[model samples]
Target: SNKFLGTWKLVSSENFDEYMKALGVGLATRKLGNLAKPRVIISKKGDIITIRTESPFKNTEISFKLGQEFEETTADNRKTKSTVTLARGSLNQVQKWNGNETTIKRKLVDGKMVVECKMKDVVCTRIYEKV
Candidate 1:
């Protein structure tokens, strides 16, 4: 968790539009998503952690403890019940919305943040540099 603290700037993303489409994100949102370069800020205090993702089009912040379930609204405005856990050196989030589920995993590699988002058969990988 300490390794994930600080702000991370988006460097590269692969197949993000396809991943968003698989999650049923609207065309306009997907278009804005493709144009926005977001930054993620992670902070931990005691047993709670906060993740804030900011972009020009949308911004979201979620706070939760490890292994606890919480309600979150996605960037696409989907309401979800989500749980976050740490396992195998990765932070994993599983979100359920309207009978659909998506998994997002975050890990550190070579001082960079690697985020893997999966929905159905589409998987998107986004790499971020620590700023």
Candidate 2:
């Protein structure tokens, strides 16, 4: 099972433009997105799951429960929003961002925590280092 019960940090990232492009994001947004080292902090309390992504540019926090749906908006008040749903025994989730819900599967791939988001035709993978 997914033991996603701790904090994780982003050690390195690659293919920012390509990943963003696969999401249909514009170049300008990709530039801004690439500049930030987004750190994710996750906590689980019973059926509730909370996640916080902080960085020098922007910070976002979300609180929800397993099997429950919730809407999430950007801190910059962006027009885009997402409905999040936790699945896979509260280990994985699908975030319906801008009408497109992407499934993110979490696993300890090769001894490293891997969060893979499977979209239309692209797989955006984010590796995490436990801290």
Candidate 3:
């Protein structure tokens, strides 16, 4: 089953400002990010999974498959052009963005679905509520 499909809410984040700075976001944008709540809605159709990131700043959508490759550009214009390889089942995946590979782990924690992102030494966690 596609457990990753749903609407996610941004509860609490650690080192969010640092991550945004690494991504080359301006101070104003970083401040805005701290105040803004971001949500991502994901859906899987057959072998392709489409993810939508929504916020007051911008909205973005990306689609990929289990073993299929794709290109994703960050808001800072840094392109993560590579393939998405499923790690465990179709729910978890390793997104190879350039030479830096990030592990995307999906699971349900407590009563909410959680998506954990590990990139290099930074780990970001997000909680979701099904809509």
Number of the predicted model whose lDDT against the real structure is largest: 1
lDDT of 1 at 11: 97
Q: Among these predicted structures, which one has the highest TM-score? A: 1
Candidate 3 residues 21-125, lDDT tens each?
655579987888778778888888887778887888877788887666678765555667546555444356565555666666767666576667666677676
Mind giving the per-residue lDDT tens digits that candidate 1 earns over 1-131? 78999999999999999998888888998899888789999998888899999987889999999898999988888899999999988999999987889999999899988999999998999999998
lDDT of 2 by residue, 9-68 (tens): 876665645756777777677777878767778787776677788888778888876566
Positional deviation of 22 in candidate 3, in angstroms?
Answer: 3.0
lDDT score, candidate 3, position 74: 57
Full-model lDDT, candidate 2: 0.66
Models 1 onward score TM values of: 0.97, 0.74, 0.76
Q: Rate the local accuracy (lDDT) of all candidates.
A: 0.92, 0.66, 0.68
How many pairs in model 2 have backbone atoms within 3 A of each other, for residues 3 or more apart or on separate chains, i.e. clashes? 0
Model 3: CA > 4 A from native: 88-101
